[PDB]
Swiss-Prot record, chain A:
It comes from Severe acute respiratory syndrome coronavirus 2 (2019-nCoV). Attaches the virion to the cell membrane by interacting with host receptor, initiating the infection. The major receptor is host ACE2. When S2/S2' has been cleaved, binding to the receptor triggers direct fusion at the cell membrane. When S2/S2' has not been cleaved, binding to the receptor results in internalization of the virus by endocytosis using host TFRC and GRM2 and leading to fusion of the virion membrane with the host endosomal membrane. Alternatively, may use NRP1/NRP2 and integrin as entry receptors. Binds to host ACE2. RBD also interacts with the N-linked glycan on 'Asn-90' of ACE2. Cleavage of S generates a polybasic C-terminal sequence on S1 that binds to host Neuropilin-1 (NRP1) and Neuropilin-2 (NRP2) receptors. Interacts with host integrin alpha-5/beta-1 (ITGA5:ITGB1) and with ACE2 in complex with integrin alpha-5/beta-1 (ITGA5:ITGB1). May interact via cytoplasmic c-terminus with M protein. May interact (via N-terminus) with host bilirubin and biliverdin, thereby preventing antibody binding to the SARS-CoV-2 spike NTD via an allosteric mechanism. Changing residue 12 to F: In strain: Omicron/BA.2, Omicron/BA.2.12.1, Omicron/BA.2.75, Omicron/BA.4, Omicron/BA.5, Omicron/BQ.1.1, Omicron/XBB.1.5, Omicron/EG.5.1. Residues 44-46 are annotated as: Integrin-binding motif. This is Spike protein S1. It comes from the Viruses. Changing residue 17 to A: In strain: Omicron/BA.2, Omicron/BA.2.12.1, Omicron/BA.4, Omicron/BA.5, Omicron/BQ.1.1, Omicron/XBB.1.5, Omicron/EG.5.1.
Swiss-Prot record, chain B:
The chain holds residues 409 to 457 of 1273 of the full protein. This is Spike protein S1. It comes from Severe acute respiratory syndrome coronavirus 2 (2019-nCoV). Residues 40-48 are annotated as: Immunodominant HLA epitope recognized by the CD8+. Attaches the virion to the cell membrane by interacting with host receptor, initiating the infection. The major receptor is host ACE2. When S2/S2' has been cleaved, binding to the receptor triggers direct fusion at the cell membrane. When S2/S2' has not been cleaved, binding to the receptor results in internalization of the virus by endocytosis using host TFRC and GRM2 and leading to fusion of the virion membrane with the host endosomal membrane. Alternatively, may use NRP1/NRP2 and integrin as entry receptors. Binds to host ACE2. RBD also interacts with the N-linked glycan on 'Asn-90' of ACE2. Cleavage of S generates a polybasic C-terminal sequence on S1 that binds to host Neuropilin-1 (NRP1) and Neuropilin-2 (NRP2) receptors. Interacts with host integrin alpha-5/beta-1 (ITGA5:ITGB1) and with ACE2 in complex with integrin alpha-5/beta-1 (ITGA5:ITGB1). May interact via cytoplasmic c-terminus with M protein. May interact (via N-terminus) with host bilirubin and biliverdin, thereby preventing antibody binding to the SARS-CoV-2 spike NTD via an allosteric mechanism. Changing residue 32 to K: In strain: Omicron/BA.1, Omicron/BA.2, Omicron/BA.2.12.1, Omicron/BA.2.75, Omicron/BA.4, Omicron/BA.5, Omicron/BQ.1.1, Omicron/XBB.1.5, Omicron/EG.5.1. Changing residue 9 to T: In strain: Gamma/P.1. It comes from the Viruses.
Amino acid sequence: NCVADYSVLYNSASFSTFKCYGVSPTKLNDLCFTNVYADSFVIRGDEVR
Amino acid sequence: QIAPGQTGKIADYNYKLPDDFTGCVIAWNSNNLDSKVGGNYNYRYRLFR
């Protein structure tokens, strides 16, 4: 129950590593989804892959 | 970010390869030359578009 604006990411560079396995990175704004779940955490560098 | 189908401030703005592009991408390190003191302004780019 909100508005997701993803154009700020491209206008102002923030994310160093940004990738989407299931969908396209640029189409997240044009296509919207019902429920969004974000799991935030921190891990070691070599543990990312 | 130089390759067919890539996304980023390079492929999106300054320089872009066709998705069907056929060719060879080459790069080599000039750091021992092109790097001058604090920066080299002879090489610029389009940051926003």
